[PDB]
Amino acid sequence: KFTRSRIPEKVFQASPEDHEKYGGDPQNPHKLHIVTRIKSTRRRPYWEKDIIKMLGLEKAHTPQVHKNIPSVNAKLKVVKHLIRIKPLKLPQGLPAEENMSNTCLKSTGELVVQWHLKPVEQ
Amino acid sequence: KKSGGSSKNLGGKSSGRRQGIKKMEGHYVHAGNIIATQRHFRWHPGAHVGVGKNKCLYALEEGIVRYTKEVYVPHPRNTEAVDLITRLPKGAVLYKTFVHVVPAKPEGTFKLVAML
Amino acid sequence: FEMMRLTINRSMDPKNMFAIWRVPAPFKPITRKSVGHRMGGGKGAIDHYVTPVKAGRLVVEMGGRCEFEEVQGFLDQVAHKLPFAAKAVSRGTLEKMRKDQEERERNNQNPWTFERIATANMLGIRKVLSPYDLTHKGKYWGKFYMPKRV
RNA sequence: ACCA
RNA sequence: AACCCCUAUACCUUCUGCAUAAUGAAUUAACUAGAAAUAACUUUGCAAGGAGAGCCAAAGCUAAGACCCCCGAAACCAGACGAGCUACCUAAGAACAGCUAAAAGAGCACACCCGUCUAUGUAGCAAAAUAGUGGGAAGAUUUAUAGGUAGAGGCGACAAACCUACCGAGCCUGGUGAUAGCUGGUUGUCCAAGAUAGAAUCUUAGUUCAACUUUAAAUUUGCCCACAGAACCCUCUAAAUCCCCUUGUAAAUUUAACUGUUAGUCCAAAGAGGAACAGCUCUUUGGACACUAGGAAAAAACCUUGUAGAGAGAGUAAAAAAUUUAACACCCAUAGUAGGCCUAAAAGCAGCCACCAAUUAAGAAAGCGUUCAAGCUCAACACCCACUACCUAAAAAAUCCCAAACAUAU
RNA sequence: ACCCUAACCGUGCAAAGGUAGCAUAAUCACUUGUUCCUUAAAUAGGGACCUGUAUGAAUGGCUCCACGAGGGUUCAGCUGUCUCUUACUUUUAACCAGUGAAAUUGACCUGCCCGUGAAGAGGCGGGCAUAACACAGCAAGACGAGAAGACCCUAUGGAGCUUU
RNA sequence: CUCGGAGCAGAACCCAACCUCCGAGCAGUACAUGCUAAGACUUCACCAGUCAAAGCGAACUACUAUACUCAAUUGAUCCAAUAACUUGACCAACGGAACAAGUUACCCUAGGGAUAACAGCGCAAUCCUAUUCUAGAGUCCAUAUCAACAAUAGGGUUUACGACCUCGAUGUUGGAUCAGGACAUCCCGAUGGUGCAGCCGCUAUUAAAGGUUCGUUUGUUCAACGAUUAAAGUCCUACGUGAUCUGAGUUCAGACCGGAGUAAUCCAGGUCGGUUUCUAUCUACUUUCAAAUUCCUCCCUGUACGAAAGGACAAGAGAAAUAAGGCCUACUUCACAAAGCGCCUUCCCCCGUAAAUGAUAUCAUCUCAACUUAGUAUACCCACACCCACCCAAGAACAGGGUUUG
RNA sequence: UAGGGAAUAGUUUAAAAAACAUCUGACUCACAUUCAGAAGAUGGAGGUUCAAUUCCUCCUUCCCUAACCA
Ligand SMILES: C[NH+](C)c1cc(NC(=O)CNC(C)(C)C)c(O)c2c1C[C@H]1C[C@H]3[C@H]([NH+](C)C)C(O)=C(C(N)=O)C(=O)[C@@]3(O)C(O)=C1C2=O
Ligand SMILES: [K+]
Ligand SMILES: [K+]
Ligand SMILES: [K+]
Ligand SMILES: [K+]
Ligand SMILES: [K+]
Ligand SMILES: [K+]
Ligand SMILES: [K+]
Ligand SMILES: [K+]
Ligand SMILES: [K+]
Ligand SMILES: [K+]
Ligand SMILES: [K+]
Ligand SMILES: [Mg+2]
Ligand SMILES: [Mg+2]
Ligand SMILES: [Mg+2]
Ligand SMILES: [Mg+2]
Ligand SMILES: [Mg+2]
Ligand SMILES: [Mg+2]
Ligand SMILES: [Mg+2]
Ligand SMILES: [Mg+2]
Ligand SMILES: [Mg+2]
Ligand SMILES: [Mg+2]
Ligand SMILES: [Mg+2]
Ligand SMILES: [Mg+2]
Ligand SMILES: [Mg+2]
Ligand SMILES: [Mg+2]
Ligand SMILES: [Mg+2]
Ligand SMILES: [Mg+2]
Ligand SMILES: [Mg+2]
Ligand SMILES: [Mg+2]
Ligand SMILES: [Mg+2]
Ligand SMILES: [Mg+2]
Ligand SMILES: [Mg+2]
Ligand SMILES: [Mg+2]
Ligand SMILES: [Mg+2]
Ligand SMILES: [Mg+2]
Ligand SMILES: [Mg+2]
Ligand SMILES: [Mg+2]
Ligand SMILES: [Mg+2]
Ligand SMILES: [Mg+2]
Ligand SMILES: [Mg+2]
Ligand SMILES: [Mg+2]
Ligand SMILES: [Mg+2]
Ligand SMILES: [Mg+2]
Ligand SMILES: [Mg+2]
Ligand SMILES: [Mg+2]
Ligand SMILES: [Mg+2]
Ligand SMILES: [Mg+2]
Ligand SMILES: [Mg+2]
Ligand SMILES: [Mg+2]
Ligand SMILES: [Mg+2]
Ligand SMILES: [Mg+2]
Ligand SMILES: [Mg+2]
Ligand SMILES: [Mg+2]
Ligand SMILES: [Mg+2]
């Protein structure tokens, strides 16, 4: 009988080697996830279809931002085969009311608060 | 072409009894609420939980349903159970699962009705 | 059993060898229907009995004043005639067989193993796996054992 | 005695 | 640049599923198929009343809008009409050569009547014929005429025959638009929501309730889910579930009003039956299909993928099948003794026990051998390295193999 | 009573216990029985014997003359039935002239091989073939045409017949 | 065929089977098994079913009690009986029509490929084949031959099983006719083994060009039998082929026997009789293609081979048959001709192995080593008038040949 | 293949009896008949029931019927 699957919690216990490959800091976890659906929910059970809708992931290749917290992670764990998860990086800090209209989410996961569409002079 | 046989097993056509817990841990019950149905005693009545003559566990008060593990001491007139405990090794204590209702409200209040 | 017994008793040295069964006698009933019958009409009648055997079980055990070379010949003959894949083994070959499997599981340079993927439901792979595949770890497909799988 |  | 190039499996119906070699359709024109209450809803009027007596009213009530197809049996009954055919009968007629025999349901044989067998013919010459060959031919014969018996019936040398070209019961009209849980039909445009737990049933080709689905209304949680919690008998100590705050989310329930769906397929998984057959049958949990597109050659059910338009832009998804195999030492051999025992005999080698000694070395003998014998290897010695890799071993059907090819440029 | 069978013995049951006949076949377990005829050769036919799942006496039994477009066996002869066909005549045919139907038909620009597929493809995949159009033949396919399968099942569809 | 318990269905609930098992259609105690009423459960609907605080009445001081033990122990409505209380179906097809059976081949209509009989397809238990294993048989000897217990793989000829295409029709068992294909080879060819002296056999490898008889009997396929034969192969092709034929069988209406039924009727039990339509639209095809097979006799030779008995072979020479292709001198049917029963002609190959030399592995070794041997067509057709007409050995029409016979 | 029925002294029938057979005796010259005595079975196994000739369930065994439509 095909059922929902329990994932052993060891699966989500990073090792020292994992930190080297991927470059996260276990002592300073990122606040926000970038989550992208990269796989259909067709040919997947309905309960995964439901969570993809709750996460705002009905359109593929469309980055959603989410909180890196246990409740949300519980959902992301059910559909972790349908998605790409990256940490949101804020090299220039949070957007401010001033630059709310100038942000760009780059493919590297960095949300820049200044978007000039110009070549770097140097 | 070939004459065939017949199955010799009749009966066995009853449908499920739909028995079991009706109120899980932490659930709020009103007096009378059937807490669980059973054919044999899986759950025993505890505090403020009555048992009907079909072993039906029901709430006697209004409040929260609890399930606990308690030591089991039968009634001395229950010959079969008493015969069981008398044959137990010294130091062995029987346990059963009990269900309780923690009453939610007091029985009443004292209110001022007159100043005469 | 008749094939195992007559071949082993005829080929063993009774003075220096003994043989014990490691399987019980047929105990599982097997039903068959009358020839030419259609589907239906109740289950058929008990026809014969069998003994279930799982992979990794010893079927017959020998010992005595002999080496492995002395028995390996005709134990391989009886094993080749069994309804499943079987092999004559020794106290020593069995152990190295198990050391080699554990050695392979350790020096395997493939970062992807069946177990890792299937336990984490990676790729939603459990939609094509059995629940039993969580413990068989890709080494079993029905009644077949694959000793190459790690 | 034996309708439903 | 008409064609050549590339892409492309008519349509309707019916189905689990149709290019299907399943249905229907030559084509054109014309004709040819959703009829209405109950309640509800919407929009007016008046309003504790409404209404042009009757009837409703605890915001009703009046009015209006808006709603439920077509063709088709075999039958059943009533009243007529039919015996110019045919069945049988009545009245009164007619025909039957020749030959044989002569008592004549005799023979042969025409006219005549019939229809055995063969062929022909099969929308014919013919809705039963033609040619030949046949049976009978003074008889229970054949035949003209008029009349009789009528369908719940007649008539019958019973074949259920015949009764006006289909008689297990005629024909016609009417009842009658018979009835059909069955098949076939069902007509302008555009958008939207929308796939199916079960129960009962003279019921399983259908219905009704539930379930799902639709519309409108109301107001409030729904879904996802943390601990804590849900059994002993006794474990295949299963994957899981139930409950459930947070959280992520936007649904959910209730009220009113309905119809349709209640003949299901493959795939994965847990089982059951069968043969651990089936494109088999039955339950369950998922998925897909019956909805697009791209893959897997064509391809319902596997993989990728969903929301709709235009573009002579762009990044991608799934997505191409790998493998090649069996060589193998060379030499050398005397001796207590044919060890006893057993056995007719057994001498390494029937079977029994024991298995010690000679020489650097050769088993009271591993395989073959015979007459129990003798013989031939192997295990020893001597010379001195044989090369030994690693596990291994297969194939045949029926119209005609089946893309072409290719080991080499990052 | 070797076996076979039982004149015979015991017991029971019925209204009576199948008599006379007849029986390898309109009849048939074994079975193509067995034997005698018949042929070179018989699962045929004839005569017998065995004896009857389930032969049998006006539901007539058993013989027999005559008779029969009845079913079957056969001698002799006869012959294109056949070995094994051939020749010719007429008809039909084909060509010219006149007259002029039918069933059928979704549309068709209507190949072959293998594979696939609602499991048997002109039409799909992969190959191969390939200027165009008359006429005469053929019948392998078009699951060719014809008649809403007479089989089988289903329908709370009919009807005929028969009954305790 | 209704109702309960257990498994399937392991842990909330639910869950099918002409699935696996076991049970119930009551007994017993009471006589408050009296009244009443919050709140609940519920067999997936409904109906029905279930549990219960408080209260009223009772009972009452040591499991009992305002709801007995017990698992099911059961039946709606109408109606009937009764003063009332209350009672009534093995209505068991158990959600129950108030009360109705057979038979149809004399049949009919509506449908269904939702469902059987034929064929196809799936499958391969059953069938068939191969290999693996070494018991066993074979005097000895496992392997010349033959094989148990098993094991593995294949085939798709049987008997089934499934119910996926066709019930607005895919009609036909055997035979005739014409045969296409497989090779698992019956015969003919080439090999290896042999318990192969020879003659015959047996077994295996290779080979599908060519061939594979006529009768008696049965409707028969099957088989038996008589004669043969080099041999009388196994299979598939919608059990090849019925718009080509046949129709004995088969299977509608008639009838008979035995049996079954009260009878109507019925019986893979016998028996006799019983309508086989089609003018071809499309596809396909209509002179592939002139290379030939086999037996027998003589001879080798009474040789080889054998103690004898017997008794051959790659040669050599004849004479046939069949199969192709022609032809008419004679014969025959005939007669300006067409024919057969007559005559004439007919031409290569094939591979399994067996051996040299010879390395890897300084011997050997036929070699998926390099290598050397056995051991790889021709013929026919072929130039192009008028295209008046006539003639023809040419011909359906058309075309072709002849006319220096217009 | 599928359902039903039936297994009682050695025999055949009953509901644990009877007639035979057997055994013992008497009668007879002897035998038979006859007479008088005697023994003699619930197919096996598995149950329940207060008690198993009517009841199980199975085995073993024999019978009967059905095995049809294309
Ligand atoms: C299978 N048995 C029951 C049987 C069957 C048939 N025939 C059929 O079943 C035919 N079936 C069809 C109708 C074809 C479907 C049968 O025809 C027969 C028989 C039984 C035998 C008995 C024979 C027996 N002997 C001689 C061997 C015997 O002793 C008797 C007797 N009466 O005692 C016989 O009569 C016997 O010879 C016989 O006639 C039998 C059958 O006829
Ligand atoms: K088709
Ligand atoms: K179809
Ligand atoms: K059709
Ligand atoms: K239809
Ligand atoms: K119906
Ligand atoms: K006869
Ligand atoms: K005879
Ligand atoms: K006659
Ligand atoms: K044709
Ligand atoms: K059909
Ligand atoms: K006919
Ligand atoms: Mg269908
Ligand atoms: Mg069509
Ligand atoms: Mg149809
Ligand atoms: Mg048509
Ligand atoms: Mg009536
Ligand atoms: Mg006459
Ligand atoms: Mg008459
Ligand atoms: Mg009659
Ligand atoms: Mg009749
Ligand atoms: Mg008429
Ligand atoms: Mg009806
Ligand atoms: Mg299926
Ligand atoms: Mg008699
Ligand atoms: Mg006779
Ligand atoms: Mg008979
Ligand atoms: Mg008989
Ligand atoms: Mg009689
Ligand atoms: Mg009578
Ligand atoms: Mg007379
Ligand atoms: Mg007459
Ligand atoms: Mg006659
Ligand atoms: Mg004659
Ligand atoms: Mg056809
Ligand atoms: Mg047709
Ligand atoms: Mg029809
Ligand atoms: Mg009716
Ligand atoms: Mg009626
Ligand atoms: Mg008849
Ligand atoms: Mg009909
Ligand atoms: Mg079908
Ligand atoms: Mg079939
Ligand atoms: Mg077909
Ligand atoms: Mg086949
Ligand atoms: Mg099915
Ligand atoms: Mg049709
Ligand atoms: Mg052929
Ligand atoms: Mg055929
Ligand atoms: Mg008829
Ligand atoms: Mg009679
Ligand atoms: Mg009769
Ligand atoms: Mg006739
Ligand atoms: Mg006939
Ligand atoms: Mg024709």
Side-chain angles (χ1 to χ4, degrees), chain C residues 28-33 44-49:
Chain C
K28 182 180 175 55
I30 300 299
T31 70
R32 272 204 162 267
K33 278 194 153 294
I46 302 176
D47 181 75
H48 64 277
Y49 290 83

Side-chain angles (χ1 to χ4, degrees), chain A residues 40-63:
Chain A
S40 187
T41 65
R42 298 304 302 160
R43 306 175 184 277
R44 297 307 306 174
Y46 66 86
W47 57 79
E48 294 173 10
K49 286 178 176 69
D50 303 345
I51 280 170
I52 285 292
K53 303 166 189 174
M54 304 161 186
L55 294 167
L57 290 179
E58 270 184 335
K59 184 179 260 291
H61 314 119
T62 312

